[PDB]
Amino acid sequence: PQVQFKLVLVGDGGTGKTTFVKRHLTGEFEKKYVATLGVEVHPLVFHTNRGPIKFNVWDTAGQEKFGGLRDGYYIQAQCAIIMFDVTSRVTYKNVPNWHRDLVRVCENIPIVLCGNKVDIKDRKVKAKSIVFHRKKNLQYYDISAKSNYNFEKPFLWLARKLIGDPNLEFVAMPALAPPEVVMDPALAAQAEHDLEVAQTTALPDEDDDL
Amino acid sequence: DDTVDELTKKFGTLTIHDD
Amino acid sequence: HFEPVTMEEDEEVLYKVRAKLFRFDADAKEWKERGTGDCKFLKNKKTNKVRILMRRDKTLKICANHIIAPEYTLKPNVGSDRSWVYACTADIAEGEAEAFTFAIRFGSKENADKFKEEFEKAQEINKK
Amino acid sequence: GSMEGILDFSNDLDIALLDQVVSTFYQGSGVQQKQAQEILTKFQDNPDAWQKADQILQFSTNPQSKFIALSILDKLITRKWKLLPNDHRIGIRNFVVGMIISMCQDDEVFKTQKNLINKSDLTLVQILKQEWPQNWPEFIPELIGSSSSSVNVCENNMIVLKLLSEEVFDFSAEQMTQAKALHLKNSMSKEFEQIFKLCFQVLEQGSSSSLIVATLESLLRYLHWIPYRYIYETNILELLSTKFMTSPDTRAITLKCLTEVSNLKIPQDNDLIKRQTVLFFQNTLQQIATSVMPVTADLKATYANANGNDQSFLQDLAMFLTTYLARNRALLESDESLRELLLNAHQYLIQLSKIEERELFKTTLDYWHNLVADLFYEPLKKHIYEEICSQLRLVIIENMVRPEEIQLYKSEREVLVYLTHLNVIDTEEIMISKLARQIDGSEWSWHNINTLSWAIGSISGTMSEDTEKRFVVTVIKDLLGLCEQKRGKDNKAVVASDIMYVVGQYPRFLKAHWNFLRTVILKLFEFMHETHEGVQDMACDTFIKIVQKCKYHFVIQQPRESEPFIQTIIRDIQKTTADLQPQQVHTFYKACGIIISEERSVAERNRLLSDLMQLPNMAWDTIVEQSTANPTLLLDSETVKIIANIIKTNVAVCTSMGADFYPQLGHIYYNMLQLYRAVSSMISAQVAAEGLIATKTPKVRGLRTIKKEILKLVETYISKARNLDDVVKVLVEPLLNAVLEDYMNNVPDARDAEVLNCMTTVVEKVGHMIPQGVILILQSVFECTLDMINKDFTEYPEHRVEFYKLLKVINEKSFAAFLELPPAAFKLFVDAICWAFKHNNRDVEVNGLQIALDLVKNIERMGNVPFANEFHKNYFFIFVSETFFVLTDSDHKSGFSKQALLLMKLISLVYDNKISVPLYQEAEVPQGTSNQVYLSQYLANMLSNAFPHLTSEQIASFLSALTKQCKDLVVFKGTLRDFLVQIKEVGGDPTDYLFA
Ligand SMILES: Nc1nc2c(ncn2[C@@H]2O[C@H](COP(=O)(O)OP(=O)(O)OP(=O)(O)O)[C@@H](O)[C@H]2O)c(=O)[nH]1
Ligand SMILES: [Mg+2]
């Protein structure tokens, strides 16, 4: 769509910024931590009752050394997500810093503060200690990229504030009648090879409820 | 006592079925 | 007198089950989740063609949209008594038609076995 | 292509090439954008790039190119500034000032390129941090002077001063040394008289709301640190509270200023300041009423509609009211003229509390708590707030949340308990009549009946027993009637659950009325047969919940009952639980265990125990008899499930019975460990036959569950066991035989981390009693586990975590085991500890540093013997250097405290001369040389090589401080933090380390 808003995603390395974005792009849950070098831009469309809304998600580097442009990335951003890790005390200590550097470049934009990884039981940053967002007028959400707890909420909130309609909901995208493609022998061999390899690679997280 | 026993009897009859 | 102040309308739901769908990345040689939500078997009232339509929870974005072709075969996955894996020659969930090796996992073994029964029922319907 | 031309610095920088590379990044997409990004990142990180900054500031037209230019300057100024010549420093200062002035005069540029102006200002402030006031004493006089000439400059000077205050007072703690912080703080403080004159002048005389906002933005930042007299002994409170609350652009910031005013440090005995504090509040609430909305305005509706900045404003109003009334409400409670003000402001909070917005509600709820707490303990206060509290009761009940949301529920309960106490009659009425509105159908919904149920349940214990009795009865009667009324199986399920929920929350009533309790329990058993979603869980959750509270009334014989009710449960246990899922049964058995532990007659407890375990012990006996006669039957997946369920049933009962479980453990112990071996064989067989993929299969995962549940049962009993002599002589030796070898001799992917976990608990409770048994545990698990986890920080996360817990408790309890390690393995122990430091994972890191700390204490405690001396010769400078590596590498900042403490202990040993031998090999240093001197030299050398940009003077000064301060921990920690600043820059002041 041409209804597109730039979103800067900031926060300490390892907080799950990239994981969160990838879950929204493909549906996958990346278990590996491959640190982002600089920034990656990912177009991410949502289907609302007031038409579609695209986000240019600038997934930025939390690690100092891999910082790249740093506050350069934030220029002309129309919204943001600040991420920390509720299993890591220091990631919430650094939230004031991420915010400081964000608002200096983006004076007046909607921002969501997100405490990720609430799926883990031994939680270090307690609910009652998270009060930073109050004076700075940020929306706060406990989230989990793994369990998908409140994973829609940051984008729903921003979509309402950007479009300027608090009754904007996500809705089911249109489901076209799928084709009736007959298969040919010239691609049956590679499907047969891929299938035997797939069957003998275990499905991950087999102790999960689904 | 008196109100308690007539509660107990009402509790016994509690169901999730219509019929 | 006082004056006053998705594209599934055409389809019947044969089976509705809660599941988690994966695609196989042949390059990475690992499974990748594609979505978690209700997996529906939808019979079109016009064509009588049964398709799989699966939407992700909350976002309600399609993560599976293909015909339950009579050619397909449900194979078991090595590490799961509650999953099926099969090749799909064309799926339109992402948009552009494209093939995948899907796997789909359910709450229990019994749920999976009902899926296989309903999936085969749907295959027989698609031979018209 | 042509884009990578810019990376060639041997030619002149092509500005048009840069501007399009920059354009490609900020307006481009796909591969184009991504390639441009990597070129800007390589350009920015080029150490020479700052030289080509003044070129870009002048010649380029693109504001993004100019932004990146200042970012390259920013990196030079903070890090490599003092290394420049003196002329370059003045040259750069000049064209940063000259850029800012020229952009501010041009009204076209001042309005449109705000991002670039603010960035320039921040780049200016980074220079002040290096250069002011020592080399720029006229900066403040000159800034005040320029502010007369041009309104745009005056406004931008308020942005500079805002950022200067932020960098010095709000963000100095981490980013600069203690000494340099105090310097810059003292420097602003010394000249603030002159800055405040200009501030108050602009606020009094200015018409430009853009200039006025920026001034108030600056004021907000001043109020963090300035003395109170600047606010109270001038007109400025009248201005904030009247003039600036009327206009909507200044309202937002003024309200945030008054919020911070409310927090100022003030004399608490001066009558004039009390009237002044009262006045500004009165004025602010007056403007809200006349200019924004009246007291009666439906703030819920306004917030929901989300017009302009209404949501931010209402957030800020809540913050202002709560903050001020938390501190100052005493001032309004005495004077009868201030009574209306007090209640109006509270009535605004009541309205704000109705706003549907979770995090805002939390804020207001914190205040209600503060208040109602005060009304409960403070005398002659509650009568004031009777109408406020009554409204609050309804607000809490209608917004009450499920107990699962633990923190929000706890806060709500606390407040509602206080409100129930303050007027029990009002609370009852609001609840009873809310219930009548569920019956008459006007406010009926699944959510609405649930919230009321959670609310009614929350106030248990607060009423009198008599009131509570009458109250409960009325509620339960009404709810039972509500159930009969409602049609359909969904509706009756919702109400039944709530009926059963409320009952569970009133244990006092259940203890006093046995006939009722018995009825409730028999009804739960009926609901354990219902197949409707969530009912069985509800029935079981409710059962154990009632049992935890009323457990005494199950274990004794009531009047008019043949036997204690525990017996009557045990009899029909089969029939009661037949329809349940396996894990629902385990809860039921666990609940039965709670009751049985209450019985203090040993013979009866044991009889009840074996009676309770009748079904799982008969299933067990028939499976032992079968599977021992032919190990083939274990491949039957159905049999593996049954065995796992039997063990899980035992775990469940052992969990609630602890030490009382020993007899039931006895019945199964020897056969269970024999099963652990038979299953172990099964698993090792499938891995050879089928490959590593075997471990992912259902049948092998099933078998492994048996092992883990057997280990879990043993851990659970030993963790809670009272008779430690029996644990040693009966349980341990069989356990170590069954588990240690199997673990050692399996391939890594078949090793259960639960083995390590189990052994941790064994060493914890009886480690001291089994020195030879602990040595056996190390030999079997240590080297082979270390090898699994010493290639990366990712693989085998359970094993890794449980591994460092096991070594910790050994090092605590049975340190003798590490002495008996051969020197080569003792070397791996040390390697393993330091390896734990380098982890980001908190569970490993904390234990890593703890083990090291305890190991040092253990060696100290050995005294002046050859092992402790050989430890210091071998490992002292390893621990010091490895501790320093993680302190200074910027990637273990979570572990700073334990690192600082470990490092201080290591240094203190040499300061007190607790290391007896020399730490240097012969002929390395002069002969009669203290370890203090050689410690200073080793560290001076070590740091010189690690941080070569440091001066010799810097390193020597830091270490003088650090060693002198190795008794006081917080000062030591301070000196470390100063070192972490100075390594990030060049030319740090060595005198900074004399701060303390
Ligand atoms: N348990 C749990 N782990 C998570 C969650 N989200 C992310 N992770 C883990 O966090 C790790 C790293 O996440 P990343 O997304 O790379 O973190 P990041 O903030 O992008 O890191 P940088 O790119 O360095 O900024 C991965 O190994 C994920 O498995 C979560 O919700 N729960
Ligand atoms: Mg990343």
Angle of the D823-837 helix axis to the D842-862 helix axis, nearest 10: 140
User: Hey, where are the domains in chain D?
Assistant: 1-996
Which residues does chain A have within 8 Å of residue D319's beta carbon, measured at their own beta carbons?
A: 134-135
Nearest atom in ligand 1 to A15's CA: 19
Chains D and C touch (3+ CB pairs under 8 A): yes
- Cβ atoms D679, D703 nearer than 8 A: yes
Indicate whether residue A148 lines ligand 1 (CB < 6 A). no
Measured between alpha carbons, how far is C71 from D694 in angstroms, rounded to an integer?
Answer: 30
Measured between alpha carbons, how far is D41 from D57 in angstroms, rounded to an integer?
Answer: 19
Alpha helices in D171-270 (DSSP H): 172-175, 178-190, 192-205, 209-222, 229-232, 236-238, 244-246, 248-261
- Cβ atoms D374, D330 nearer than 8 A: no
Could you tell me the CA-to-CA distances from D569 to D288, D495, D513, D520, D558 in Å, in that order?
Answer: 64, 26, 19, 13, 15
DSSP string computed for D425-465: HHHHHHHHHHHHHHHSSTT--HHHHHHHHHHHHHTTTTS-H
Would the CA dihedral through D76, D79, D85, D89 be positive or negative?
positive
Annotate A72-91 with b (16+ C-beta within 10 A) or e (fewer). bbbbebbbbbbbbbbbbebb
- Cβ atoms A31, D7 nearer than 8 A: no
Task: Tell me, yes or no, if C43 comes closer than 8 A to chain A by beta carbon.
Answer: no
Interface test with A, best of D25, D42, D43, D171 (most A CBs within 10 A): D25
Could you tell me the CA-to-CA distances from D648 to D655, D710, D716, D979 in Å, in that order?
Answer: 10, 8, 12, 54
Measured between alpha carbons, how far is D128 from D167 in angstroms, rounded to an integer?
Answer: 10
Domain of residue C105, residue span: 1-128
Task: Tell me, yes or no, if C108 comes closer than 8 A to chain A by beta carbon.
Answer: no
Nearest to D22 by CA among D53, D54, D64: D64
Measured between alpha carbons, how far is C55 from D673 in angstroms, rounded to an integer?
Answer: 48
Measured between alpha carbons, how far is D642 from D620 in angstroms, rounded to an integer?
Answer: 9
- When divided into structural domains, chain C yields a total of 1
Nearest atom in ligand 1 to A34's CA: 16
Nearest CA in chain C to A202: C79
Measured between alpha carbons, how far is D22 from D64 in angstroms, rounded to an integer?
Answer: 7
Name beta bridge partners: A79. Answer: A7
- Cβ atoms D939, D952 nearer than 8 A: no
Indicate whether residue A119 lines ligand 1 (CB < 6 A). yes
The structure tokens listed for D224 are 């963090």
The structure tokens listed for D906 are 């290591």
Angle of the D931-946 helix axis to the D952-964 helix axis, nearest 10: 130
| D551: helix, strand or coil | coil
User: How many residues comprise chain A?
Assistant: 210
Measured between alpha carbons, how far is A54 from A4 in angstroms, rounded to an integer?
Answer: 4
CA A24 from centroid of its chain's CA atoms = 6
d(CA A18, ligand 1 centre) in Å: 7
Chains C and A touch (3+ CB pairs under 8 A): yes
> Could C61 and A175 be called an inter-chain contact, meaning their C-beta atoms sit closer than 8 Å?
no
Measured between alpha carbons, how far is D568 from D557 in angstroms, rounded to an integer?
Answer: 11
Measured between alpha carbons, how far is D825 from D532 in angstroms, rounded to an integer?
Answer: 60
* Vertex D848: Cα angle to D844 and D849 (nearest 5): 125
Diameter over CA atoms, chain C: 73
My answer on whether omega of the bond before D631 falls inside 30° of 0, hence cis, is: no
Could you tell me the CA-to-CA distances from D369 to D118, D364, D374, D406 in Å, in that order?
Answer: 42, 9, 8, 16
- Ligand lying nearest the CA atom of residue A147: 1
Closest partner residue to D519 (CB to CB) among B8, B15, B16 is: B8
> Could D693 and C78 be called an inter-chain contact, meaning their C-beta atoms sit closer than 8 Å?
yes
CA A46 from centroid of its chain's CA atoms = 13
The structure tokens listed for D498 are 């709530």
Nearest to D826 by CA among D767, D787, D867: D867
Which residues does chain C have within 8 Å of residue A206's beta carbon, measured at their own beta carbons?
A: 79-80
Alpha helices in D551-598 (DSSP H): 552-555, 565-571, 573-577, 582-598
d(CA A14, ligand 2 centre) in Å: 7
- In CATH, what number is assigned to the domain containing residue C38? 2.30.29.30
Measured between alpha carbons, how far is D314 from D317 in angstroms, rounded to an integer?
Answer: 5
Which residues does chain D have within 8 Å of residue B15's beta carbon, measured at their own beta carbons?
A: 492
- Cβ atoms A82, A38 nearer than 8 A: no
- Cβ atoms A163, A50 nearer than 8 A: yes
Indicate whether residue A37 lines ligand 1 (CB < 6 A). no
Measured between alpha carbons, how far is D605 from D556 in angstroms, rounded to an integer?
Answer: 12
Name beta bridge partners: C88. Answer: C100
Indicate whether residue A99 lines ligand 1 (CB < 6 A). no
**Residues 28..57 of A with a Cβ closer than 8 Å to C: which?**
28-29, 46-47
- Cβ atoms A85, A117 nearer than 8 A: yes
Nearest CA in chain A to C127: A180
Could you tell me the CA-to-CA distances from D859 to D779, D812, D827, D832, D948 in Å, in that order?
Answer: 22, 12, 15, 17, 34
Would the CA dihedral through D640, D641, D642, D648 be positive or negative?
positive
Could you tell me the CA-to-CA distances from D910 to D313, D620, D886, D958 in Å, in that order?
Answer: 60, 62, 21, 17
Measured between alpha carbons, how far is C4 from B18 in angstroms, rounded to an integer?
Answer: 40
Torsion angle in degrees (nearest 10) through CA of D62, D68, D74, D77:
-80
Nearest to D334 by CA among D380, D276, D287, D397: D380
CA D136 from centroid of its chain's CA atoms = 43
Residue D900 amino acid letter: A
Resolution for this PDB entry, in angstroms: 2.7
d(CA A143, ligand 2 centre) in Å: 17
Task: Tell me, yes or no, if D691 comes closer than 8 A to chain C by beta carbon.
Answer: no
Phi-psi region of A174 (alpha: psi -120 to 50; beta: other; left: phi over 0): beta
> Could D171 and A100 be called an inter-chain contact, meaning their C-beta atoms sit closer than 8 Å?
yes
User: How many residues comprise chain C?
Assistant: 128
D122 contact partners, CB below 8 Å, separation of at least 6: A104, D74, D163
DSSP letter at D241 equals I
Cα-atom radius of gyration of chain D, to the nearest Å?
37
> Could A199 and C79 be called an inter-chain contact, meaning their C-beta atoms sit closer than 8 Å?
no
Place of tokens 């219509």: B18
Binding residues of A for GTP: 12-19, 30-36, 62, 116-119, 144-146
Measured between alpha carbons, how far is D413 from D416 in angstroms, rounded to an integer?
Answer: 5
- Ligand lying nearest the CA atom of residue A16: 1
Residue C9 amino acid letter: E
- Cβ atoms A119, A147 nearer than 8 A: yes
CA D827 from centroid of its chain's CA atoms = 36
- Cβ atoms D146, D180 nearer than 8 A: no
Could you tell me the CA-to-CA distances from D798 to D743, D746, D753, D786 in Å, in that order?
Answer: 15, 17, 6, 13
The structure tokens listed for D535 are 């009912």
| C102: helix, strand or coil | strand
> Could C24 and A194 be called an inter-chain contact, meaning their C-beta atoms sit closer than 8 Å?
yes
Neighbours of A196 (CB within 10 A): 10
- In CATH, what number is assigned to the domain containing residue A13? 3.40.50.300
Nearest atom in ligand 1 to A14's CA: 17
* Ion ligand 2 — residues with CB < 5 Å: A 17-18, 36
Q: What is the 3-state secondary structure (H, E, C) of D699-767?
A: HHHHHHHHHHHHHHHHHHHHHCCCCHHHHHHHHHHHHHHHHHHHHHHCCHHHCCHHHHHHHHHHHHHHH
Measured between alpha carbons, how far is A138 from A55 in angstroms, rounded to an integer?
Answer: 19
D589 contact partners, CB below 8 Å, separation of at least 6: D612, D649, D652, D653
Place of tokens 């003030």: D266
The structure tokens listed for D24 are 């490609």
Give the determination technique. X-ray
What's the gap in Å between the CA of C110 and the closest CA on chain D? Answer: 14
